[PDB]
């Protein structure tokens, strides 16, 4: 009974190559990149999102797949969905990366730090920080890596204004929103330090007191049959509105079990029909500007009847 919601930039003036910064802890920290990279290999989901927000998706030649997955993300359109794979984000395939003969490689120090020297020997390589709450800084690093700092500045400025405008029109500050993600065996309740939390903050939506922690991304509650038969407490998940995504198909197949469970039916948001199923790629795994706009779109339901 839970409603389902789901959810080319011109280069800066300069020479044909530019210096760009790697994330802190990458050696070396500076890398010379082309001003107009024609064949980009992207190894992290947030950078793929960034290239789409910059209108550069037709220059991507391959992308690392989400781990345990067998396909590219679909929330970014068919051109990205059809991209060849180069292994997964946690284990990129260097032979396939070399086979794409890229002139630019984007990756993340939070995913494959050990791989940077081998990647840099194939093509100019830029590593951003780990994806998550700092997505806007990661976007800024993609902007420098593609010589599109001005373009990224406008995307960030336009997003902040757009998010604030949506929050004002829909009275976001008067609602506490909960962020929940189901896995096959557990329920994850996200706090205030992660990708979707930072987008809810940009819109101005409040969070329930149980979801304001910042020491970790989420807390995890068991949801197996043995767990449910031990009278668990899901009250950390309650709010005025609950946004719930499923981390996998097996999680989706068990979602209705948890939503029908006695511990979940105790939640006031469930009684009030204010639990909404949302796209996990938009809310959890994309972690970029296009995903962020999808979350803002879903947040338009905070003041719905």
Author numbering: 42 to 48, 60 to 357
Task: Quote what the paper states about this structure.
The structure of FecB was solved to 2.0 Å in space group C2, and the asymmetric unit contains two FecB molecules (chain A, 42–356 and chain B, residues 45–357, where numbering is for the unprocessed FecB form). Notably, FecB has an extra N-terminal sequence that associates with the C-terminal lobe but has an unstructured connection between the N- and C-terminal lobes (dashed black line). The substrate binding pocket of FecB is quite different from that of FecB2 in contributing residues, shape, and electrostatic charges. The FecB binding pocket has three tyrosine, four asparagine, three glutamine and two arginine residues along with a glutamate and aspartate residue, Figs 2A and 3. The binding cleft of FecB2 contains three arginine and two glutamine residues along with one glutamate, aspartate and tyrosine residue to provide polar contacts with a bound ligand; and three tryptophan and three phenylalanine residues. The resulting FecB pocket is narrower and deeper than the FecB2 ligand-binding pocket, with one side pinched together creating an almost triangular chasm, Fig 2. In contrast, the back of the FecB pocket is negatively charged. Indeed, this charged environment trapped a polyethylene glycol molecule from the crystallographic condition. Mtb FecB has highest structural similarity to ferric-siderophore binding proteins such as Bacillus cereus YfiY (2.5 Å rmsd), Staphylococcus aureus SirA (3.1 Å rmsd) and HtsA (3.6 Å rmsd). Out of the ten variants tested (R141S, L163R, Q233S, R240S, Y242S, Y270S, E272S, D322S, Q336S, and E339S), there was only one variant, E339S, that had a considerably reduced affinity to Fe-cMB. Ultimately, the affinity of the E339S variant was so diminished that it was unmeasurable due to the solubility limits of Fe-cMB. This acidic residue, Glu339, is situated at the back of the FecB ligand binding pocket.
Mtb FecB and FecB2 are predicted periplasmic binding proteins implicated in host iron acquisition; however, their precise roles are not well understood. In vitro ligand binding experiments for FecB and FecB2 were performed with heme and bacterial siderophores from Mtb and other species, revealing that both FecB and FecB2 bind heme, while only FecB binds the Mtb sideophore ferric-carboxymycobactin (Fe-cMB). Mtb FecB and FecB2 are both members of the type III PBP family. Each protein structure is composed of N- and C-terminal lobes consisting of mixed α/β structures with a central β-sheet surrounded by α-helices, with the two lobes linked by a rigid “backbone” helix (α6), forming the characteristic fold of the type III PBP family.
